[PDB]
């Protein structure tokens, strides 16, 4: 599913990001944006052999098992495929994992390069949440 900007941050309010580790529903929605474009359908494979899965591309070598990233971990306990849902439960689940590993939102270079230091508001403005 391709999600409109105000779709998902409707969305990834109900799933509870708004304010997640003090991260404001703009963040998670410039994120998103600049990671997938709002497709849940994304994979882009990576020079180490691991591939970013979802509209938050989650990676394989760290959080979900494809079965073809060896000796990689699984930390997120589900399969790479879960993250491609149009429903984004999976994702959200494994993003609140992540932000909470100790770099923040830091993990996502899109967000650490296209998001933060910018008005992030500007990503849910006009929006009925
Ligand atoms: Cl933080
Ligand atoms: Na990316
Ligand atoms: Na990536
Ligand atoms: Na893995
Ligand atoms: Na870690």
């Known amino acids: 599913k391709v999600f409109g900007r105000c779709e998902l941050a409707a969305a990834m309010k109900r799933h509870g990001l708004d304010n997640y580790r003090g991260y404001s529903l703009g963040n998670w929605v410039c994120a998103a944006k600049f990671e997938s474009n709002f497709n849940t359908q994304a994979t882009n494979r990576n020079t180490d052999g691991s591939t970013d899965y979802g509209i938050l591309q989650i990676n394989s070598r760290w959080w979900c098992n494809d079965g073809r990233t060896p000796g990689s971990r699984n930390l997120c ?7 491609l849902s149009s429903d984004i439960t999976a994702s959200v689940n494994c993003a609140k994992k992540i932000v909470s590993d100790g770099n923040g939102m830091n993990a996502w270079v899109a967000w650490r390069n296209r998001c933060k230091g910018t ?4 990503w849910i403005r006009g929006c009925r949440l």
């Not at 306990?77 to 993250?83: E, Q, R, T, V």
């Not at 008005?119 to 500007?122: G, I, L, N, P, W």
């Open 77 to 83: 306990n589900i399969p790479c495929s879960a993250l």
């Open 119 to 122: 008005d992030v508001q500007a």
